[PDB]
Amino acid sequence: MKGFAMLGINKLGWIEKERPVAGSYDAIVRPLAVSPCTSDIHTVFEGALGDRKNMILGHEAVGEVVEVGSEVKDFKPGDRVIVPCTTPDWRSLEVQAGFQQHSNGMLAGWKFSNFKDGVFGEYFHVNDADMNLAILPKDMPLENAVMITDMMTTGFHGAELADIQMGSSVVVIGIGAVGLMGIAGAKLRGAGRIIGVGSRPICVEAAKFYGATDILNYKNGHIVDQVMKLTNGKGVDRVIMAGGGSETLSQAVSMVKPGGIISNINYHGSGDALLIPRVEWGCGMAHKTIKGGLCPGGRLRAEMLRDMVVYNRVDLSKLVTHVYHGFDHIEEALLLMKDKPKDLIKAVVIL
Amino acid sequence: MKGFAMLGINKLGWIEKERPVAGSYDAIVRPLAVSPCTSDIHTVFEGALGDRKNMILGHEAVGEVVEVGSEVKDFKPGDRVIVPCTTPDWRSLEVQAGFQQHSNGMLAGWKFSNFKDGVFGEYFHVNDADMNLAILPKDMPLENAVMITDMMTTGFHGAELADIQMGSSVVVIGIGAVGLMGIAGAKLRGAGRIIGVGSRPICVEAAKFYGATDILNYKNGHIVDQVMKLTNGKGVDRVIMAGGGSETLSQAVSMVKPGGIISNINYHGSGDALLIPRVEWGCGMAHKTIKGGLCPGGRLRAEMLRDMVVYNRVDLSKLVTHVYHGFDHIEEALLLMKDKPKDLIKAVVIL
Amino acid sequence: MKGFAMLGINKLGWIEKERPVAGSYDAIVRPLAVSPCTSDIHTVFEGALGDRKNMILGHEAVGEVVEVGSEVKDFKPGDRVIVPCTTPDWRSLEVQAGFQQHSNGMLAGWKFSNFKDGVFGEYFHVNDADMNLAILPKDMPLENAVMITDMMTTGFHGAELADIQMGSSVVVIGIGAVGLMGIAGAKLRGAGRIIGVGSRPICVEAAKFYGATDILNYKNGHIVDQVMKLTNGKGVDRVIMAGGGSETLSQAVSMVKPGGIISNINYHGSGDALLIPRVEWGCGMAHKTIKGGLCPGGRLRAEMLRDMVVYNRVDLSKLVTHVYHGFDHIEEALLLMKDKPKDLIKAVVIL
Amino acid sequence: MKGFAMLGINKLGWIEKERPVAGSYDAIVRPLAVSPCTSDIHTVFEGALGDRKNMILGHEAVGEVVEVGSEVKDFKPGDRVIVPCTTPDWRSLEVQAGFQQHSNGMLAGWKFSNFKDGVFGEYFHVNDADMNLAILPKDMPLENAVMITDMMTTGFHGAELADIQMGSSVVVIGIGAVGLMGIAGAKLRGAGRIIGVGSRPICVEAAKFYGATDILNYKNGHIVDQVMKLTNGKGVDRVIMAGGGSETLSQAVSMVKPGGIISNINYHGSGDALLIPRVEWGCGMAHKTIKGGLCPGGRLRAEMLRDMVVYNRVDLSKLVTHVYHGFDHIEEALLLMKDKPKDLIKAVVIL
Ligand SMILES: NC(=O)C1=CN([C@@H]2O[C@H](COP(=O)(O)OP(=O)(O)OC[C@H]3O[C@@H](n4cnc5c(N)ncnc54)[C@@H](OP(=O)(O)O)[C@@H]3O)[C@@H](O)[C@H]2O)C=CC1
Ligand SMILES: NC(=O)C1=CN([C@@H]2O[C@H](COP(=O)(O)OP(=O)(O)OC[C@H]3O[C@@H](n4cnc5c(N)ncnc54)[C@H](OP(=O)(O)O)[C@@H]3O)[C@@H](O)[C@H]2O)C=CC1
Ligand SMILES: NC(=O)C1=CN([C@@H]2O[C@H](COP(=O)(O)OP(=O)(O)OC[C@H]3O[C@H](n4cnc5c(N)ncnc54)[C@@H](OP(=O)(O)O)[C@@H]3O)[C@@H](O)[C@H]2O)C=CC1
Ligand SMILES: NC(=O)C1=CN([C@@H]2O[C@H](COP(=O)(O)OP(=O)(O)OC[C@H]3O[C@H](n4cnc5c(N)ncnc54)[C@@H](OP(=O)(O)O)[C@@H]3O)[C@@H](O)[C@H]2O)C=CC1
Ligand SMILES: [Zn+2]
Ligand SMILES: [Zn+2]
Ligand SMILES: [Zn+2]
Ligand SMILES: [Zn+2]
């Protein structure tokens, strides 16, 4: 079997690996459409995961089931499915506590291109098919469906953790794919004023489409001061961190009102720590709560998000800017994510 | 001054009273636009409230401040304001416990036409102006603004008490003005499938506009069976009670699944009591939570909802079907809320 | 093997049955100590559950592991174990939604004596050993340990659902074993004044020991009037329903304050419906929330409650009033729960 | 009138002030018993809360009403009362939002020795008597009653914000007065294992009395490694920060499990920021929530805590180690808080 893998730190190329076997409760799937992610780039060129030798990359896909284990009861070869990027082991004490994302370990719910070969191969492995897969509606465009697996679930989780009320004012820092879904999520929770922060034109138009009432360019002046001008020195009720450096935490604390909430969905990968400004945090007594976490996965989450798309609660087509046709294009696509052209949001490869 | 009032149970009439005087923290306001509510019909022609002696009616209005006490600091004579139907006494133990709606007594937060002279007069009295009033936006249409004072705040409250999740299925029983706002609120909390119950043609079209994906007519058969057929026998996640008789409670319990929530915003003005079906309620162990409460009021609630309108999160114009001009039309308007002509939702009298 | 079973509605007797076999993830356990429950009396004599035939009874036990499947990793033959009355199927959609108690159906988390052969037999089956068992501490008395499997988990759950604030006034209707654990749980959540309702002397003493500050006898007149006089006409903050007929719901509604919460842990197995008094419920606008649910189970719940006992947070010995030695005493012990002698609370049979 | 005040940074001494006069809703009270706080030390000798001049210190007291405004209805001259350290302005928007502690500004609910003359004077002013005072029980020792005003409300708030589960493992960093009430509060919320961190002998014994199951000291090396050895390398469910430097946030993050909560009640007096270790915080994706807030106040809170003491839920006498007689001893008492003698916890001065 051939697939696109990380040969080592800073090196990637096509390799030959043996096709994975399926256990009694597993399923083997072949990709129909895939999409490169920002995290893939960070593991290869930044060593954000350690040293990996010959590991196939990727964690965002939709495909066809080609083989199932003896105990699989809800799926069979031929089924077209949506695969959530987070596929946890449902039999754990962490699950009994209410935290699927950390089943058997911190972030252990994230398997593809971490401690298991990714989806950028002729075939890939899915653990516990009945608990980690959802059926793909026949009339749903493949491009749009791939956006559910990670972008939609991550951004919407940001709005959920933020505990938004009807009429609350919100600020979203970073307007890339994840940030754009954070804006959409906030509107879908009843937010009044929504302020997006970014600079790339293509992202700015998308931000307004999803619900942004105000746009701020961080390169044109201290972002905190800009927020105060807009709110007449009052601040905002909630803040969502979706992009930028570790210093965005300090900015968030300075703009939120006493009693407000800060929600992080950005994976920080540089430096030794993040800092909380003491005075602005009311010396630790201003009731300014800080939250953050990996997107939830599994079958239920996938089906609920799918239905929202079916009932037109959100239009996912705006996130996809580049579409390719043919297995070999997986290479050209990942390269596109590395160079970050100004006209790019997300790219999908249809096999 | 003159004012339309309830002389006694089943008797209405115009009486001559002394113009109200404001205390140190109060304000006297003259109405600009008002609207009749079905709640007053219950209290008067069915004595659902009790026996009253010469009490002026009405609780939904937009007006102009005329006089203020020596201690009022944020409002002055000539200001245009939005008056919330619930005007709590903020200096009470109930407020300290977190329940403004019951300051100094069960339902006491709501004063107009409950036990205090209402808005259907040349002038009326508002307690604690600085804590219970909100400025009316310059470009905002009067008819629309009146819908915030009661309909919007009650409907959204139903969606808030329901604790809706992203992708949850919801059923709204009763599609009158209040129910329509319940549908709009549910969509704005992330609901997936939304099923509306009613029959009036004008109310049905409005329901779809606000977000309903399915419509059911209770006259065609038992609604529980209808819902089960639509959901292949699964039932729904949430239920909002916005209309009908006491028997609607039993229906909600039967259609909601284990662990779901039932939210009541309907004002039951008759009957000795409501029933909960033992078997369907899982003998009291199915985790089917039942909630119910009076709509929130005060300045903050008014400002937060106002801003949602300003940011186009919801279009209130679809609620106003009838508009009159001239103070004397008040009596005629209140009668319509009793007659209920098939093409009516809410009516406003612009003075 | 033999086991004490329900032959049919109003029928009890010992039967001969085949010893259960274990699957790859199961375990076969032999009982060391068991206890009878009032729920079994509702099932057998009240038929409040449906029809059953030759179903072994009992759901409260501690035992020894005899055999385990090939995939069981944390348990082996020879281990002493605490078995929760609720043993869910962790691989289900209800679990993904946060309601283990209803995995694969309403109340489906509770299997023993509900629809699966109970613990009153020479051996019994436990589904998913690693996920549904807990090790019994070396020096823990068998009689005390049994109280954890149901009484402790149910009573505490009533206090948990009540969302008690520090200093809240509480009324516990019914002072049997479940109500006694409800009083203890309420105290362990920060309650101030705790009023218990009952009559049996032995229970009255236990109520005081667990935290009750006031005791009221329901056979002395209108219980609501009694409560009002004690509270100078103010009412109480919370109410936990743990005993009595369906009319206790009306009483709870009348004595609870607007904005309060009513928590039901009483398994109602008689009648058609429970009544909610219209006027006292503020016509459905008093924010008087009503909850009710089955007790949680699984390995995590058992281990957590176990540790609470080990750290002396609660003394379970006061619940066990009768102790027998020998399998044959199961029949007599169960009958006691039907007739209820004046000096009984709970009984345990050690094999 | 005379009082003990802060002359300037690092300066303390008695001065003369005009006798405070009451407004319509206010009351003038003379102290009967008071106590010094570590907060006062951070303001005077650390210039934490900016620079103050001639401000009377103190915020913990019990006293007698000597004068009331024309509008006061529940309190009269001669009444003995309990005064909560937090006395919020109930007519504010923050109160409408559910945050009394920040009425009219960040931390503005706390007035005494923050920006208003404290209780260390012959007479002091209490805003809104009917909403901010509680009657002192006839037979309640003055020393005990003063511990309600701040220590009890603060420690218990740490437990409340921590959202403790029945059986949760908890670690309390800092075992002084506040940390002691933190341990007591956690037990009254159902905690199982409670590990305290401190070394002072008198505190170590009081900690065990309140509920601590394990005690750790810094001499043994890395506090994290110690916690890991005790927990088999698993960590704990919750962490309450009650004392120590800002580096304790880092320790809390490293010892808490993914999905846990960190609760801060420690008033951090110096430093630019608090540091969060990137890797241990799971790059901000491990769901480790961070909270922190000022203690609640007002009439309801005071009465509720008062009743918890009346019903013997907590014994406050263990906090008072030093008792002085005569107004003049305030200076000596306040100095002890700075010196920190090995046998001190709290000191009370009776007039
Ligand atoms: N006190 C306060 O501040 C306020 C309280 N409330 C209360 O909320 C409630 C809703 O008022 P409103 O919106 O004016 O209601 P309406 O009287 O206009 O009727 C609402 C709906 O109930 C339906 N309905 C009738 N019978 C049934 C049935 N048997 N089964 C299912 N549905 C049925 C409808 O059917 P159809 O289409 O046939 O008419 C109609 O769409 C009222 O009781 C009101 O007092 C609302 C606002 C304020
Ligand atoms: N399915 C499950 O897993 C379980 C369900 N449950 C359920 O919870 C409930 C409680 O069980 P248990 O504690 O064993 O009950 P008991 O049979 O011991 O009775 C408890 C109390 O109810 C009383 N009572 C009777 N009538 C009234 C009344 N009119 N008003 C007030 N109190 C009254 C008592 O009075 P007196 O003092 O005179 O007897 C007694 O104090 C039962 O339904 C049981 O099935 C409990 C455990 C498990
Ligand atoms: N592990 C998982 O399963 C996943 C984790 N995540 C994580 O969430 C995060 C967001 O990813 P993605 O949406 O692809 O983001 P992008 O890389 O496209 O960038 C988003 C934003 O960051 C910007 N930015 C840079 N500096 C600042 C600044 N100083 N202030 C404000 N904004 C700034 C933007 O400006 P400009 O317009 O100039 O670029 C841009 O709008 C990433 O860390 C990602 O790994 C996301 C998906 C999956
Ligand atoms: N503003 C308000 O209304 C109030 C604010 N607060 C605040 O809460 C916080 C606590 O006061 P309180 O508990 O009375 O204070 P204390 O000064 O008595 O000290 C408490 C603990 O801190 C210790 N300690 C020192 N360094 C460390 C460390 N590095 N790690 C762990 N523990 C350490 C202790 O050790 P040892 O045992 O060796 O002494 C002691 O047990 C203070 O900042 C205070 O201002 C409290 C009340 C009111
Ligand atoms: Zn991704
Ligand atoms: Zn109304
Ligand atoms: Zn039972
Ligand atoms: Zn203090």
Short mmCIF file of N, CA and C in Angstrom, two decimals, chain A residues 156 159-160 163-168 185-194 210-214 237 301 304-305 307-308 311 313, chain B residues 156 159-160 163-168 184-185 187-194 211-214 237 301 304-305 307-308 311-313:
data_model
loop_
_atom_site.label_atom_id
_atom_site.label_comp_id
_atom_site.label_asym_id
_atom_site.label_seq_id
_atom_site.Cartn_x
_atom_site.Cartn_y
_atom_site.Cartn_z
N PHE A 156 -17.33 25.34 16.85
CA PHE A 156 -18.58 25.29 17.61
C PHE A 156 -18.32 24.99 19.08
N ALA A 159 -17.66 28.18 21.05
CA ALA A 159 -18.87 28.90 21.41
C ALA A 159 -19.59 28.24 22.58
N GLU A 160 -19.53 26.91 22.64
CA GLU A 160 -20.16 26.15 23.72
C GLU A 160 -19.48 26.40 25.07
N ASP A 163 -20.17 29.67 27.09
CA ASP A 163 -21.44 29.85 27.80
C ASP A 163 -22.11 31.20 27.51
N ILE A 164 -22.35 31.45 26.23
CA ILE A 164 -22.96 32.69 25.74
C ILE A 164 -24.44 32.84 26.11
N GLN A 165 -24.84 34.07 26.42
CA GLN A 165 -26.22 34.40 26.78
C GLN A 165 -26.83 35.23 25.66
N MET A 166 -28.16 35.36 25.67
CA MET A 166 -28.83 36.12 24.62
C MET A 166 -28.59 37.62 24.72
N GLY A 167 -27.79 38.13 23.79
CA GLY A 167 -27.46 39.54 23.77
C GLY A 167 -26.03 39.83 24.18
N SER A 168 -25.28 38.80 24.58
CA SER A 168 -23.88 38.95 24.98
C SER A 168 -22.98 39.48 23.86
N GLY A 185 -20.63 29.81 15.32
CA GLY A 185 -21.11 29.20 16.56
C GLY A 185 -21.67 30.22 17.54
N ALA A 186 -20.99 31.36 17.69
CA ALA A 186 -21.42 32.43 18.60
C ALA A 186 -22.79 32.99 18.23
N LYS A 187 -23.01 33.17 16.94
CA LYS A 187 -24.29 33.67 16.45
C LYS A 187 -25.39 32.64 16.77
N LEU A 188 -25.05 31.37 16.62
CA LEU A 188 -25.98 30.27 16.88
C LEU A 188 -26.22 30.01 18.37
N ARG A 189 -25.70 30.88 19.23
CA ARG A 189 -25.91 30.77 20.68
C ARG A 189 -26.64 32.03 21.18
N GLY A 190 -26.94 32.95 20.26
CA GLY A 190 -27.66 34.16 20.61
C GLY A 190 -26.88 35.44 20.87
N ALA A 191 -25.61 35.47 20.50
CA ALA A 191 -24.79 36.66 20.72
C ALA A 191 -25.30 37.89 19.99
N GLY A 192 -25.07 39.06 20.59
CA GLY A 192 -25.47 40.30 19.96
C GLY A 192 -24.32 40.79 19.09
N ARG A 193 -23.44 41.58 19.68
CA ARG A 193 -22.29 42.12 18.97
C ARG A 193 -21.17 41.09 18.87
N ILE A 194 -20.60 40.93 17.68
CA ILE A 194 -19.50 39.99 17.46
C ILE A 194 -18.38 40.73 16.73
N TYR A 210 -20.46 35.02 8.13
CA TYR A 210 -20.87 34.18 9.26
C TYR A 210 -21.45 34.92 10.47
N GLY A 211 -21.35 36.25 10.50
CA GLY A 211 -21.93 36.98 11.62
C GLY A 211 -21.19 38.13 12.28
N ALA A 212 -19.96 38.42 11.86
CA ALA A 212 -19.20 39.51 12.47
C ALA A 212 -19.84 40.87 12.24
N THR A 213 -20.03 41.63 13.32
CA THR A 213 -20.61 42.97 13.24
C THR A 213 -19.53 44.04 13.17
N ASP A 214 -18.29 43.66 13.51
CA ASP A 214 -17.13 44.57 13.51
C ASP A 214 -15.87 43.76 13.17
N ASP A 237 -18.51 40.81 26.97
CA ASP A 237 -18.93 39.71 27.84
C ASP A 237 -18.13 38.41 27.68
N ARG A 301 -21.79 13.19 18.19
CA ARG A 301 -21.38 14.54 17.81
C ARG A 301 -21.44 14.70 16.29
N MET A 304 -25.20 14.89 15.09
CA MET A 304 -25.83 16.16 15.48
C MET A 304 -25.36 17.32 14.59
N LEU A 305 -24.06 17.35 14.28
CA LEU A 305 -23.51 18.41 13.43
C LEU A 305 -23.98 18.23 11.99
N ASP A 307 -26.84 16.92 10.96
CA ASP A 307 -28.22 17.39 10.90
C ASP A 307 -28.32 18.91 10.80
N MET A 308 -27.45 19.61 11.53
CA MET A 308 -27.45 21.07 11.47
C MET A 308 -27.18 21.51 10.03
N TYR A 311 -30.34 20.79 7.83
CA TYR A 311 -31.41 21.77 8.03
C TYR A 311 -30.96 23.21 7.75
N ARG A 313 -28.52 25.19 8.91
CA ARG A 313 -28.28 26.10 10.02
C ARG A 313 -26.96 26.86 9.79
N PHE B 156 -38.13 33.93 24.26
CA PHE B 156 -36.71 33.59 24.40
C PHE B 156 -36.45 32.90 25.74
N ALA B 159 -36.81 29.28 25.54
CA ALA B 159 -35.67 28.62 24.90
C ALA B 159 -34.47 28.55 25.84
N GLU B 160 -34.35 29.53 26.72
CA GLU B 160 -33.25 29.58 27.69
C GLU B 160 -33.44 28.51 28.77
N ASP B 163 -32.44 24.78 27.91
CA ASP B 163 -31.03 24.36 27.85
C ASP B 163 -30.75 23.51 26.60
N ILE B 164 -30.97 24.12 25.44
CA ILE B 164 -30.79 23.51 24.13
C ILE B 164 -29.31 23.33 23.76
N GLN B 165 -29.00 22.24 23.06
CA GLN B 165 -27.63 21.97 22.62
C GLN B 165 -27.55 22.03 21.09
N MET B 166 -26.34 22.12 20.56
CA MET B 166 -26.14 22.21 19.11
C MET B 166 -26.55 20.92 18.40
N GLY B 167 -27.67 20.99 17.67
CA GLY B 167 -28.16 19.82 16.96
C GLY B 167 -29.36 19.15 17.62
N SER B 168 -29.78 19.65 18.79
CA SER B 168 -30.93 19.08 19.50
C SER B 168 -32.22 19.25 18.70
N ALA B 184 -38.04 31.09 17.31
CA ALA B 184 -36.92 31.95 16.95
C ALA B 184 -35.77 31.78 17.96
N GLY B 185 -36.14 31.71 19.24
CA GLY B 185 -35.16 31.54 20.30
C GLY B 185 -34.46 30.20 20.24
N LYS B 187 -33.90 28.30 17.56
CA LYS B 187 -32.95 28.30 16.45
C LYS B 187 -31.68 29.05 16.84
N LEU B 188 -31.85 30.15 17.57
CA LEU B 188 -30.74 30.97 18.04
C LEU B 188 -29.96 30.35 19.21
N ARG B 189 -30.26 29.10 19.56
CA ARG B 189 -29.54 28.39 20.62
C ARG B 189 -28.86 27.15 20.01
N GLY B 190 -28.97 27.01 18.69
CA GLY B 190 -28.34 25.90 17.99
C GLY B 190 -29.17 24.66 17.65
N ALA B 191 -30.49 24.74 17.81
CA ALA B 191 -31.37 23.61 17.53
C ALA B 191 -31.29 23.12 16.07
N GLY B 192 -31.44 21.81 15.89
CA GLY B 192 -31.42 21.22 14.56
C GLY B 192 -32.83 21.19 14.01
N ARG B 193 -33.55 20.11 14.29
CA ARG B 193 -34.93 19.98 13.82
C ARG B 193 -35.88 20.72 14.77
N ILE B 194 -36.80 21.51 14.21
CA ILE B 194 -37.78 22.26 15.02
C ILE B 194 -39.21 22.00 14.50
N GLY B 211 -37.94 29.62 11.58
CA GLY B 211 -37.09 28.45 11.72
C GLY B 211 -37.67 27.05 11.76
N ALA B 212 -38.99 26.91 11.87
CA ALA B 212 -39.61 25.58 11.93
C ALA B 212 -39.33 24.74 10.69
N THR B 213 -38.96 23.47 10.90
CA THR B 213 -38.69 22.57 9.78
C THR B 213 -39.89 21.65 9.50
N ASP B 214 -40.83 21.57 10.45
CA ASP B 214 -42.02 20.73 10.32
C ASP B 214 -43.19 21.43 11.01
N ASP B 237 -35.61 15.81 21.85
CA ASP B 237 -34.73 16.22 22.95
C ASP B 237 -35.37 17.25 23.90
N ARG B 301 -32.01 43.34 30.83
CA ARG B 301 -32.70 42.44 29.92
C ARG B 301 -33.20 43.22 28.71
N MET B 304 -30.15 44.26 26.35
CA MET B 304 -29.56 43.11 25.66
C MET B 304 -30.44 42.63 24.50
N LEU B 305 -31.75 42.57 24.72
CA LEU B 305 -32.68 42.16 23.67
C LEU B 305 -32.74 43.24 22.58
N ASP B 307 -30.45 45.28 21.60
CA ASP B 307 -29.26 45.17 20.76
C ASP B 307 -29.33 44.00 19.77
N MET B 308 -29.97 42.90 20.17
CA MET B 308 -30.12 41.76 19.27
C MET B 308 -30.94 42.19 18.05
N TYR B 311 -28.86 44.43 15.74
CA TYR B 311 -27.90 43.65 14.96
C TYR B 311 -28.54 42.64 14.01
N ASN B 312 -29.85 42.79 13.79
CA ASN B 312 -30.60 41.92 12.88
C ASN B 312 -30.57 40.43 13.21
N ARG B 313 -30.58 40.09 14.49
CA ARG B 313 -30.57 38.68 14.88
C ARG B 313 -31.98 38.09 14.77
#
